[PDB]
Design an enzyme around this catalytic site. Structure first.
Site, PDB file in Angstrom:
ATOM      1  N   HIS A  63      48.244   8.707 -55.631  1.00 36.82           N
ATOM      2  CA  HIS A  63      47.439   9.785 -56.247  1.00 36.82           C
ATOM      3  C   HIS A  63      45.935   9.514 -56.117  1.00 36.82           C
ATOM      4  O   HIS A  63      45.152  10.430 -55.918  1.00 36.82           O
ATOM      5  CB  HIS A  63      47.799   9.951 -57.728  1.00 36.82           C
ATOM      6  CG  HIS A  63      49.268  10.060 -57.961  1.00 36.82           C
ATOM      7  ND1 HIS A  63      49.993  11.173 -57.579  1.00 36.82           N
ATOM      8  CD2 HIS A  63      50.147   9.204 -58.527  1.00 36.82           C
ATOM      9  CE1 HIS A  63      51.260  11.008 -57.917  1.00 36.82           C
ATOM     10  NE2 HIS A  63      51.385   9.808 -58.470  1.00 36.82           N
ATOM     11  N   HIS A  93      39.197   4.286 -61.237  1.00 39.88           N
ATOM     12  CA  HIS A  93      39.607   5.065 -60.075  1.00 39.88           C
ATOM     13  C   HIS A  93      38.674   6.279 -60.007  1.00 39.88           C
ATOM     14  O   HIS A  93      37.863   6.528 -60.903  1.00 39.88           O
ATOM     15  CB  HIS A  93      41.072   5.533 -60.229  1.00 39.88           C
ATOM     16  CG  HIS A  93      41.274   6.380 -61.446  1.00 39.88           C
ATOM     17  ND1 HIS A  93      41.510   5.859 -62.701  1.00 39.88           N
ATOM     18  CD2 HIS A  93      41.147   7.717 -61.617  1.00 39.88           C
ATOM     19  CE1 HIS A  93      41.553   6.852 -63.570  1.00 39.88           C
ATOM     20  NE2 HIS A  93      41.306   7.984 -62.939  1.00 39.88           N
ATOM     21  N   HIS A  95      38.407  10.638 -58.647  1.00 42.58           N
ATOM     22  CA  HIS A  95      38.991  11.905 -58.198  1.00 42.58           C
ATOM     23  C   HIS A  95      37.945  12.532 -57.292  1.00 42.58           C
ATOM     24  O   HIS A  95      36.741  12.435 -57.561  1.00 42.58           O
ATOM     25  CB  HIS A  95      39.287  12.847 -59.373  1.00 42.58           C
ATOM     26  CG  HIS A  95      40.135  12.225 -60.438  1.00 42.58           C
ATOM     27  ND1 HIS A  95      41.487  12.447 -60.512  1.00 42.58           N
ATOM     28  CD2 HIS A  95      39.842  11.360 -61.450  1.00 42.58           C
ATOM     29  CE1 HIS A  95      41.989  11.762 -61.526  1.00 42.58           C
ATOM     30  NE2 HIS A  95      41.014  11.101 -62.114  1.00 42.58           N
ATOM     31  N   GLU A 105      36.593  16.475 -62.073  1.00 40.74           N
ATOM     32  CA  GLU A 105      37.557  17.007 -63.029  1.00 40.74           C
ATOM     33  C   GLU A 105      36.789  17.743 -64.147  1.00 40.74           C
ATOM     34  O   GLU A 105      36.949  18.944 -64.361  1.00 40.74           O
ATOM     35  CB  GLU A 105      38.423  15.861 -63.556  1.00 40.74           C
ATOM     36  CG  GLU A 105      39.240  15.214 -62.456  1.00 40.74           C
ATOM     37  CD  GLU A 105      40.546  14.654 -62.947  1.00 40.74           C
ATOM     38  OE1 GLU A 105      40.506  13.789 -63.835  1.00 40.74           O
ATOM     39  OE2 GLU A 105      41.594  15.098 -62.460  1.00 40.74           O
ATOM     40  N   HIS A 118      36.322   7.325 -63.158  1.00 43.63           N
ATOM     41  CA  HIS A 118      36.902   7.056 -64.452  1.00 43.63           C
ATOM     42  C   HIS A 118      37.101   5.574 -64.663  1.00 43.63           C
ATOM     43  O   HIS A 118      37.898   4.939 -63.967  1.00 43.63           O
ATOM     44  CB  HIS A 118      38.242   7.780 -64.579  1.00 43.63           C
ATOM     45  CG  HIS A 118      38.084   9.261 -64.659  1.00 43.63           C
ATOM     46  ND1 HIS A 118      39.107  10.146 -64.400  1.00 43.63           N
ATOM     47  CD2 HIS A 118      37.003  10.011 -64.981  1.00 43.63           C
ATOM     48  CE1 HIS A 118      38.668  11.377 -64.549  1.00 43.63           C
ATOM     49  NE2 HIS A 118      37.387  11.326 -64.887  1.00 43.63           N
ATOM     50  N   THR A 197      44.284  12.858 -67.548  1.00 46.49           N
ATOM     51  CA  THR A 197      44.212  14.026 -66.670  1.00 46.49           C
ATOM     52  C   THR A 197      45.311  14.066 -65.602  1.00 46.49           C
ATOM     53  O   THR A 197      45.330  14.997 -64.785  1.00 46.49           O
ATOM     54  CB  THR A 197      42.849  14.142 -65.972  1.00 46.49           C
ATOM     55  OG1 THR A 197      42.749  13.082 -65.029  1.00 46.49           O
ATOM     56  CG2 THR A 197      41.693  14.152 -66.961  1.00 46.49           C
ATOM     57  N   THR A 198      46.213  13.083 -65.618  1.00 48.39           N
ATOM     58  CA  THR A 198      47.408  13.104 -64.781  1.00 48.39           C
ATOM     59  C   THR A 198      48.596  12.898 -65.692  1.00 48.39           C
ATOM     60  O   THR A 198      48.474  12.338 -66.789  1.00 48.39           O
ATOM     61  CB  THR A 198      47.428  11.990 -63.719  1.00 48.39           C
ATOM     62  OG1 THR A 198      47.331  10.695 -64.332  1.00 48.39           O
ATOM     63  CG2 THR A 198      46.269  12.138 -62.775  1.00 48.39           C
TER      64      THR A 198
END
Ligand SMILES: NS(=O)(=O)c1ccc(NS(=O)(=O)c2ccc(Br)cc2)cc1
Ligand SMILES: [Zn+2]
Length: 259
Positions: A63, A93, A95, A105, A118, A197-198
């Site tokens: 992901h 990590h 996004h 996000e 994040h 958020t996942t």
């Protein structure tokens, strides 16, 4: 955990079928309406203490990629700000998007940044991460926007190891990385109560989103976009657009640390 992802058939609009909390009361990310966020003079300056941080490994989990830290001692902690107590850094990590015009996000007055970092921390009063995620004040995630411009020198070590973790399930040693090199100058922030958020989308996060983005170069983010969602020997699917869109704010207030 399962077959969720960021495709047409398994992306954010599908997650609620396996994770009904997707439609909950404190979901993340959100749009930060800068003119309705209220300055809260009771908020304390953020305390980011990363001098003794011990990075261990970098992992492509299918992901994103995670840089993992030794969280067996109080090294690398986040305190102050809106937080009560001490939160220990476990991983960071990002996004990011397929194009520079999307990838974050959180949004700011509907602006999307090219990416979002994040830094994930867990509340030491719960003993470990797995217990912390079951609590409404279990995690603190420090979010930092990325815009494309000048290179971020402190990001380059991360960029250069990505070739070695192209596909899902690959990891590489990643010791002695200093996450202080990913911070902006200012620690001014917005804060609100939210979620992962996942999936599993647990409502366990105090979000702290920095106002000042960091700048990264086009070449740096282009290398993020060469990663793969798939495993080795599988059809190549570029790891891009691994962001969840903004969710309803519902009965929440976003507070600003600054006037
Ligand atoms: N994008 S985010 O909100 O910062 C985020 C942070 C940590 C996680 N951790 S995890 O859900 O993959 C996870 C949950 C429980 C345990 Br135990 C291990 C990992 C997920 C999303
Ligand atoms: Zn994240």
């Amino acid at each position: 955990a399962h077959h969720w992802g960021y495709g047409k058939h398994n992306g954010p609009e599908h997650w609620h079928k396996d994770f009904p909390i997707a439609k909950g009361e404190r979901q993340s990310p959100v749009d930060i309406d800068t003119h309705t966020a209220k300055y809260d003079p009771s908020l304390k300056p953020l305390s980011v203490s990363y001098d003794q941080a011990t990075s261990l490994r970098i992992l492509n989990n299918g992901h994103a990629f995670n840089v993992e830290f030794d969280d067996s001692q109080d090294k690398a902690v986040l305190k102050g700000g809106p937080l009560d107590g001490t939160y220990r850094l476990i991983q960071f990590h990002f996004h990011w998007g397929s194009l520079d015009g999307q990838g974050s996000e959180h949004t700011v007055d509907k602006k999307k940044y090219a990416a979002e970092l994040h830094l994930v921390h867990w509340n030491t009063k719960y003993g470990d991460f797995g217990k912390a995620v079951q609590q409404p004040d279990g995690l603190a995630v420090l979010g930092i926007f990325l815009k494309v411009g000048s290179a971020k020198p402190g990001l380059q070590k991360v960029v250069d190891v990505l070739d070695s973790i192209k596909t899902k399930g690959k990891s590489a040693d990643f010791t002695n990385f200093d996450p202080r090199g990913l911070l902006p100058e200012s620690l001014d922030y917005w804060t609100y109560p939210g979620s992962l958020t996942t999936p599993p989308l647990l409502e366990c996060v105090t979000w702290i989103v920095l106002k000042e983005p960091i700048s990264v170069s086009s070449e740096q983010v282009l290398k993020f976009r060469k990663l793969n969602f798939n495993g080795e020997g599988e059809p190549e699917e570029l790891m891009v657009d691994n962001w969840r869109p903004a969710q309803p704010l519902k009965n929440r207030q976003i507070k600003a640390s600054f006037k």
